[PDB]
Amino acid sequence: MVVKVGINGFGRIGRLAFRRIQNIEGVEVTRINDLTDPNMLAHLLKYDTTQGRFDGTVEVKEGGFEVNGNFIKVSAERDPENIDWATDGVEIVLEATGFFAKKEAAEKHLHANGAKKVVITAPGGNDVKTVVFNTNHDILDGTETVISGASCTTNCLAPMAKALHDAFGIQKGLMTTIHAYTGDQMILDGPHRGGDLRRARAGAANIVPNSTGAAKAIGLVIPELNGKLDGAAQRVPVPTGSVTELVVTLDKNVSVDEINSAMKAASNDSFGYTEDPIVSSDIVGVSYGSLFDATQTKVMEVDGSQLVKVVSWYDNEMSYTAQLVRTLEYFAKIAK
Amino acid sequence: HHHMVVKVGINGFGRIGRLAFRRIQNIEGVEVTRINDLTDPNMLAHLLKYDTTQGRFDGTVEVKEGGFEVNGNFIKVSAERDPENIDWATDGVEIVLEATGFFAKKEAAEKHLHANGAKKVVITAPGGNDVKTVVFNTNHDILDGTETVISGASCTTNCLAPMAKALHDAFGIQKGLMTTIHAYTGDQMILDGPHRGGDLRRARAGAANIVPNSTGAAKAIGLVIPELNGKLDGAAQRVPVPTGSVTELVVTLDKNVSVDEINSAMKAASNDSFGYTEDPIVSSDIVGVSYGSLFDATQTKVMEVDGSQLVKVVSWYDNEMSYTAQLVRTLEYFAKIAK
Amino acid sequence: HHHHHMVVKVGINGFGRIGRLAFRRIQNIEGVEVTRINDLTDPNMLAHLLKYDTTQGRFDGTVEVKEGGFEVNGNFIKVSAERDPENIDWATDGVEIVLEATGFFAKKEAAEKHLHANGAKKVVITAPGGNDVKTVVFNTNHDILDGTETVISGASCTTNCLAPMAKALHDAFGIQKGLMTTIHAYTGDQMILDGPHRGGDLRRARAGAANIVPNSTGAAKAIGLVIPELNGKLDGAAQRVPVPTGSVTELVVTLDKNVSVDEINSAMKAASNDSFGYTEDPIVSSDIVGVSYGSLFDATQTKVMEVDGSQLVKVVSWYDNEMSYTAQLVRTLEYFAKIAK
Amino acid sequence: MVVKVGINGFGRIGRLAFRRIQNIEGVEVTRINDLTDPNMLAHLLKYDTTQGRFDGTVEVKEGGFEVNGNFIKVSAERDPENIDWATDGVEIVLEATGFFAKKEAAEKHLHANGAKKVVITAPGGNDVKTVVFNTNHDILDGTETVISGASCTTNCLAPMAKALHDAFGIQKGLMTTIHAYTGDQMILDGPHRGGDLRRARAGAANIVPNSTGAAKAIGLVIPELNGKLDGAAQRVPVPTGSVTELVVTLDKNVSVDEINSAMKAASNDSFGYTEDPIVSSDIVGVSYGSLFDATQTKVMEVDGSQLVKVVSWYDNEMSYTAQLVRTLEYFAKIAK
Numbered sequence A, D: 001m002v003v004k005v006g007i008n009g010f011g012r013i014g015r016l017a018f019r020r021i022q023n024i025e026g027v028e029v030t031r032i033n034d035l036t037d038p039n040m041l042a043h044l045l046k047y048d049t050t051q052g053r054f055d056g057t058v059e060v061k062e063g064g065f066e067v068n069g070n071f072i073k074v075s076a077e078r079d080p081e082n083i084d085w086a087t088d089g090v091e092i093v094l095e096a097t098g099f100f101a102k103k104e105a106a107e108k109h110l111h112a113n114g115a116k117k118v119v120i121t122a123p124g125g126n127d128v129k130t131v132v133f134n135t136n137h138d139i140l141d142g143t144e145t146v147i148s149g150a151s152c153t154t155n156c157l158a159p160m161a162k163a164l165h166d167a168f169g170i171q172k173g174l175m176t177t178i179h180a181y182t183g184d185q186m187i188l189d190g191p192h193r194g195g196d197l198r199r200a201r202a203g204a205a206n207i208v209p210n211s212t213g214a215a216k217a218i219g220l221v222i223p224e225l226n227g228k229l230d231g232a233a234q235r236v237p238v239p240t241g242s243v244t245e246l247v248v249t250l251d252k253n254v255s256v257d258e259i260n261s262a263m264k265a266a267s268n269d270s271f272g273y274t275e276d277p278i279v280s281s282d283i284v285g286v287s288y289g290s291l292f293d294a295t296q297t298k299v300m301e302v303d304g305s306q307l308v309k310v311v312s313w314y315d316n317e318m319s320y321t322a323q324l325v326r327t328l329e330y331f332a333k334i335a336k
Numbered sequence B: 001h002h003h004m005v006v007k008v009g010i011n012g013f014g015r016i017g018r019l020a021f022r023r024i025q026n027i028e029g030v031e032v033t034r035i036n037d038l039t040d041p042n043m044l045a046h047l048l049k050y051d052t053t054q055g056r057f058d059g060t061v062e063v064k065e066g067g068f069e070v071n072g073n074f075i076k077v078s079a080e081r082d083p084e085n086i087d088w089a090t091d092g093v094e095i096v097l098e099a100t101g102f103f104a105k106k107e108a109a110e111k112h113l114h115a116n117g118a119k120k121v122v123i124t125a126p127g128g129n130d131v132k133t134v135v136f137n138t139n140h141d142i143l144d145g146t147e148t149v150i151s152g153a154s155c156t157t158n159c160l161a162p163m164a165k166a167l168h169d170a171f172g173i174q175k176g177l178m179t180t181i182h183a184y185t186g187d188q189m190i191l192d193g194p195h196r197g198g199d200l201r202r203a204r205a206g207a208a209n210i211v212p213n214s215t216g217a218a219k220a221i222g223l224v225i226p227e228l229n230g231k232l233d234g235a236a237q238r239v240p241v242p243t244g245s246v247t248e249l250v251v252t253l254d255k256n257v258s259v260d261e262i263n264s265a266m267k268a269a270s271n272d273s274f275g276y277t278e279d280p281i282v283s284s285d286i287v288g289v290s291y292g293s294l295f296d297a298t299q300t301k302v303m304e305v306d307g308s309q310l311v312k313v314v315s316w317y318d319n320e321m322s323y324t325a326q327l328v329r330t331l332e333y334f335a336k337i338a339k
Numbered sequence C: 001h002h003h004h005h006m007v008v009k010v011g012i013n014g015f016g017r018i019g020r021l022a023f024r025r026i027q028n029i030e031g032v033e034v035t036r037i038n039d040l041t042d043p044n045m046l047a048h049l050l051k052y053d054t055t056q057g058r059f060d061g062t063v064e065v066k067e068g069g070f071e072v073n074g075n076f077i078k079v080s081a082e083r084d085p086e087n088i089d090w091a092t093d094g095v096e097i098v099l100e101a102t103g104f105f106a107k108k109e110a111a112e113k114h115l116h117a118n119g120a121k122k123v124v125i126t127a128p129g130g131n132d133v134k135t136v137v138f139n140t141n142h143d144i145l146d147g148t149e150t151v152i153s154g155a156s157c158t159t160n161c162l163a164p165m166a167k168a169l170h171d172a173f174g175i176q177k178g179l180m181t182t183i184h185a186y187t188g189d190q191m192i193l194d195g196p197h198r199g200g201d202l203r204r205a206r207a208g209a210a211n212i213v214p215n216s217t218g219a220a221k222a223i224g225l226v227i228p229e230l231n232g233k234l235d236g237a238a239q240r241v242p243v244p245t246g247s248v249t250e251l252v253v254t255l256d257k258n259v260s261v262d263e264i265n266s267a268m269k270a271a272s273n274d275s276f277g278y279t280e281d282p283i284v285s286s287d288i289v290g291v292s293y294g295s296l297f298d299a300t301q302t303k304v305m306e307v308d309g310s311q312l313v314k315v316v317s318w319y320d321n322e323m324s325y326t327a328q329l330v331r332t333l334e335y336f337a338k339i340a341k
């Protein structure tokens, strides 16, 4: 059986998730909810500044739009309690608005005429299972009603930290992600509705420090690293594409070659490995959740003690979205 | 030490609202006593202090309860979405700078004029066909001071108007098309996403695209230069600079002209609002300038075939500070003559 | 890749934006093969820049550096680093037609340096090449070629955008005179930050990704090389703006006939083909990056301003100054190679 | 009583140095050498994308230009041995081309018709005195013939690292500078003359990793930190303005408040202190060589051991230039 999915928030993550679902057999989108009309959503699906033209035909209709002739209903309900997901057979909602990223808020979708389960496309608090595909999706059994796909940065950091910890033992660490600007930053200096005096600044014209919980919350994905990491972000003027640096001390003294070999050994469809001196535009659109860059590995040793630096790339858009849809595809197969 | 001031309120402490506040600091006859926006005083104080394109504030800013002090002088801050709930009169406010983008029509702006409100409103944008629309030093003579709502026009209008008027007075504009290559603004999306105004092009990442867009400046020029009503139209290309813009105008004229003739006519019309340059500048060179319009003699062109000519004239403007300088010139003058 | 299409061997002088994108498009045609690349650098730099491309994406295939060149899908291509075309032994690698894409030899006598006794046989300049070389916009005037030419020009990006639009408008309604503005991506000839411009251009000296930068362009004045009836009728200029590729051309004219917006748009759509596209969607510049049209007419930007019975008419066409031009350039190269003799 | 100065390389640092010298008494520029016509240099001095209009008048003349009425000679000699610095009385040369930044190369200026001293506006190798003003300018005695004003990153890092080391003892450290793009990166993807596969990439459209020697070479300015630090850079799309992050282990456990207090106590004209959540555009044009940002300080502690993070802003243009001219001014006064 195909599992019918709804998208709440047809934004950067919602629209790219829709795109990837077109190539998934076990899942199909039957309903989109946002705050606008079908022509606006159909246009944003067709044309994409950073991810290119949509691969398919899109035609606006009354009450929605057709993708290759398949009608998808569009509604514009600000309150999840008012989205009649059940009318379109939706069982799983991708909660991608940025405004319901907590357990009780996501549960608003699960009313009498709503859906059955929710995947939050963001950190969702410490009382919802938080899944980085191919790092801890084993924790799912399908009975969950609300789960989280974590953040872009968590999906980048987690395979790198886990491989390094499994091989050498992370004692403590600090993370800096140099991160594309996102839709939550202001295009020009102005009041930020979340009260962030730095996200209030022109996002494409500044290096912007910002907090991020990815390192401090890593225990949701790698329990043994709870209480071991912290970090922050520098938001910079690229419209997508990011990189995560992690500096740790380890239980073992290591060489750069030994580090790079341990990362390569852990590589898979989610965690890539490169030795090419790439830049951020080269990871736009990739499907790895995290691309380890061996060219940036460093070890600083003084008096027999080492600081170790490991670096991994990610397209905060498509890398995260590929991970999100892998998790959604797996969750849908085992949902009950 | 003096008290010869008209008290002003700012609705919308945004790019234009904050820069207007900055310029009013150097005006003796007007004083801002009340700001209304949608946020708390620390956000507004911080945005006044630090400014990506216009630099650090020239003075001290300190957050206080219910507002902030600028060089020790308290400015009250409120956060009322609806003008009917702003008690402008409590702070002695006579004139409101309506700079939110959400009340830029006569009946909307008049919401500030309730029984506990202000006496007059200046809309920092085009305000419709039924409010006096003023480009300072081009038509501020139309004001008599009895008006309750006026418009400061748009940035593009304040750039276009002195150039079009100088050209029309000298040679007679028959018809024209305008293109403004314009910085992105806060009404465009930082990344591709639903645009609340329904504009499928403003929906696109504004700092990563050349974005065509409509503009009414040329079509509505008759509010400022009546002789040019029904003679001009145009459009915009929004491009990835965070401020700074340029207006190109192509016309046919009653008289055949040379490039030197055109440039001389522009220079003879230059003043505090309409500048003149022969240096090959680029857009960053006009950020912060106080001209409403800076004619660029290096871009003038004449294309003649069979004794008929197309004429091109180009003028720079900082859509932020150029407009704001014009806006505050108009506010200062209006304040002097207000009922 | 067993086929019966005759193959002409091509060399690329200047493995830059146009040179590398030309190489990419030639991968997908069979009548032409690149067997030699000349630039000023080492093979690993060129291989890396082929593999990874900020605006046009990852190369479609494998690229591996080797001694003296690199392999593309396992096929070795020789790389040399000769500053003077007279020292490029094109003939050693069987090259018969050279793509002159350095920007430093864009005139007849300069391009002929490639045609020495151990050199090539013909040159295609990837730029305006002067008044005395045939200048070709594919699907507008490539019929002027007879195959005997030794040096030809693929014109400029702006010319390939403007030409089909101006030709269609002129054929339908008669252009009397016109002015053009192209709002154009910055290019490699602008400075990344304020600094001395080798060409002496005080505006290309300025930081290209941080400014709106006016600049000259000869596309409108030189249109007579492509559309003879429009010689002496057009002029224009450019505004370079901060996008790394993607451009748009506005043309304002007066016409022999009074027209409506719908009549203009209809005339453009009737003239559409592989080189001249037509859209009614409200797109922006990133939507044409990588497009293979030389020119994409945008019906949403058409305007007519009429006063006292006379009209100004505005028509607008998009172009990726990189891939739009390169698609046209390789169409012309492919056609030229077929008829070359 | 006025030392005459020549500028080789009227670029970003050369022109901003000229601008700052306008406002000091002891030195005056009497000769400019570059590779171009006087109108090009006059135009670039008058109009400046990131640093604003020149404060004064600039008029092109024959063989040079006038600044506020005073003629400055302009020449275009590619080889320093051909620059007759002596005929304009030039005593000290600011070597700001980027092409003569080592001892023997800079000494080409000191020919029989040349200057007597040269200040390299860049790292100049490990055999020339390397000066960060108000950190180690006391090493100069005035007899030197070639000195170095270090790099922008060094002038940022040094006062921060010195104050932290003096207070708590740095054991080892790794540095990341998130740095504006510069003139040595390509405006669009193309062959990089220095052979750098990452500086070959479009500088205003990418996050670009790159090496930097500031941390490894810190021993030239702070000898006790020789062999203790390393690091790297991420070049990002702002045209000027940068930030330096430093992660260390220390001999003493500390609090965030203790760190911030130690930095504020060390603040002076070169080393600023802020607690405001600023972004990169807020330090453009600033005259601190380094502006410590107390809002980004972090301490990560596990098992009684800590990683400590300290961060400082710098306008790689004007911050470095203010430091360079401070050193030039002092060097001129003790020159012998």
Ligand SMILES: NC(=O)c1ccc[n+]([C@@H]2O[C@H](COP(=O)([O-])OP(=O)(O)OC[C@H]3O[C@@H](n4cnc5c(N)ncnc54)[C@H](O)[C@@H]3O)[C@@H](O)[C@H]2O)c1
Binding pocket: A008, A009, A010, A011, A012, A013, A014, A033, A034, A035, A077, A078, A079, A096, A097, A098, A099, A101, A121, A122, A150, A151, A152, A182, A183, A184, A316, A317, A320, B192, B193, B194
């Ligand atoms: N790099 C990224 O962009 C990224 C990466 C990983 C996770 N996320 C997370 O994904 C979520 C969405 O981020 P985004 O970048 O796509 O933002 P976005 O602004 O592009 O999309 C949000 C969408 O939600 C719509 N919306 C807002 N409120 C709504 C409501 N009450 N009801 C229905 N629709 C509503 C908006 O109109 C918009 O289309 C956030 O939680 C964000 O933290 C973003």
Ligand SMILES: NC(=O)c1ccc[n+]([C@@H]2O[C@H](COP(=O)([O-])OP(=O)(O)OC[C@H]3O[C@@H](n4cnc5c(N)ncnc54)[C@H](O)[C@@H]3O)[C@@H](O)[C@H]2O)c1
Binding pocket: A189, A190, A191, B011, B012, B013, B014, B015, B016, B017, B036, B037, B038, B080, B081, B082, B099, B100, B101, B102, B104, B124, B125, B153, B154, B155, B185, B186, B187, B319, B320, B323
């Ligand atoms: N180049 C320019 O930016 C420019 C030039 C000329 C005119 N204008 C005009 O000035 C006006 C403001 O433009 P801007 O660029 O400064 O926009 P902005 O977004 O920077 O500022 C708008 C401000 O209004 C606040 N606000 C929004 N709704 C409000 C409400 N109901 N009540 C109180 N405050 C509210 C917002 O929080 C914001 O601070 C627009 O009408 C615009 O067309 C802008």
Ligand SMILES: NC(=O)c1ccc[n+]([C@@H]2O[C@H](COP(=O)([O-])OP(=O)(O)OC[C@H]3O[C@@H](n4cnc5c(N)ncnc54)[C@H](O)[C@@H]3O)[C@@H](O)[C@H]2O)c1
Binding pocket: C013, C014, C015, C016, C017, C018, C019, C038, C039, C040, C082, C083, C084, C101, C102, C103, C104, C106, C126, C127, C155, C156, C157, C187, C188, C321, C322, C325, D189, D190, D191
């Ligand atoms: N939008 C565009 O970029 C565009 C569009 C149409 C036409 N053109 C034209 O194509 C040509 C190349 O433009 P580009 O953007 O690719 O520039 P580019 O700088 O990216 O490439 C030029 C290449 O030529 C190399 N080179 C320079 N001098 C050389 C020499 N003497 N010998 C061998 N190689 C040399 C350079 O190292 C570089 O790789 C120009 O004539 C330009 O006007 C460019």
Ligand SMILES: NC(=O)c1ccc[n+]([C@@H]2O[C@H](COP(=O)([O-])OP(=O)(O)OC[C@H]3O[C@@H](n4cnc5c(N)ncnc54)[C@H](O)[C@@H]3O)[C@@H](O)[C@H]2O)c1
Binding pocket: C194, C195, C196, D008, D009, D010, D011, D012, D013, D014, D033, D034, D035, D077, D078, D079, D096, D097, D098, D099, D101, D121, D122, D150, D151, D152, D182, D183, D316, D317, D320
């Ligand atoms: N953030 C910065 O820009 C920065 C900061 C600190 C130090 N530096 C250092 O300052 C130096 C210059 O940097 P920049 O950014 O100002 O570069 P730039 O390209 O802006 O200026 C260099 C100038 O030198 C000219 N020039 C080149 N070769 C010459 C030669 N043989 N003879 C005479 N003039 C020549 C060039 O025409 C140019 O004007 C570099 O060593 C650089 O590492 C730069």
